[PDB]
Design a protein around this ligand. Structure first.
Ligand SMILES: [Cl-]
Length: 221
């Protein structure tokens, strides 16, 4: 009835962490799906289907759609009869993950449209310029940030990851059971590898994301 992850359509971007949430559950549960990567400036492909420019969204066999990544994950888990453990990781780690946001806006986000692995998300110059024009509101100037990565944000990310690392386990983030902590935290580690040349990704986090990469079709940057 289903195949190993290596029929229903899932519309997404490669770089989007909310889409990573869906691919994580889909690949680990061997959910049979067809990955549809939408160009960043292809507004009509989003709006014609779900009426808004957002990803991810899943198309069922009956032609109806599910948006919201959390709801797509629960649907896939139901279809596959695949258990997802509840969140158990310490609130300290959740707070540290939240503190990464102002820094990865400056360190990682400007690299999104230009990274060679994101060419599927940005197959044209207009898709790249679309993203830059659309995201420069709350990010800033992409050229200035790319030429001068703020080292205070580099230090802040390194320090936060150092504080998080003792709590990170294998095979999954809370050891044996795949959980909602994997769903909510791994996408943050995933996008961090876009700037691995600038950042210090510690041992436990490195082993954890390498295991997720091995068990899925998600490739780290
Ligand atoms: Cl979106």
């Amino acid at each position: 009835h289903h195949h190993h992850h290596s029929a229903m359509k899932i519309y997404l971007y490669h770089h989007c962490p909310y889409c990573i949430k869906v691919r994580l559950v889909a690949d680990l549960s061997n959910f049979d799906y067809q990955m549809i990567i939408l160009a960043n400036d292809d507004e009509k492909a989003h709006i014609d289907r779900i009426g808004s420019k957002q990803v991810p969204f899943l198309e069922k066999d009956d032609g109806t759609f599910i948006k919201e990544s959390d709801e797509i994950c629960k649907f896939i888990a139901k279809v596959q009869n695949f258990e997802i453990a509840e969140s158990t990781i310490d609130d300290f780690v959740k707070g540290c993950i939240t503190d990464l946001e102002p820094h990865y806006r400056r360190i990682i986000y400007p690299r999104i449209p230009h990274h060679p692995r994101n060419e599927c998300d940005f197959p044209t110059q207009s898709a790249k310029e679309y993203f830059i024009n659309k995201k420069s509101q709350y990010i800033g100037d992409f050229d200035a940030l790319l030429r001068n990565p703020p080292y205070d944000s580099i230090r802040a990310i390194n320090q936060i990851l150092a504080k998080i690392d003792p709590f990170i386990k294998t095979p999954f983030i809370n050891s044996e059971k795949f959980s909602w902590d994997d769903i909510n935290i791994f996408p943050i580690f995933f996008i961090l590898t876009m700037s691995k040349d600038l950042l210090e990704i510690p041992t436990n986090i490195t082993n954890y994301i390498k295991n997720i990469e091995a068990k899925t079709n998600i490739e780290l940057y």
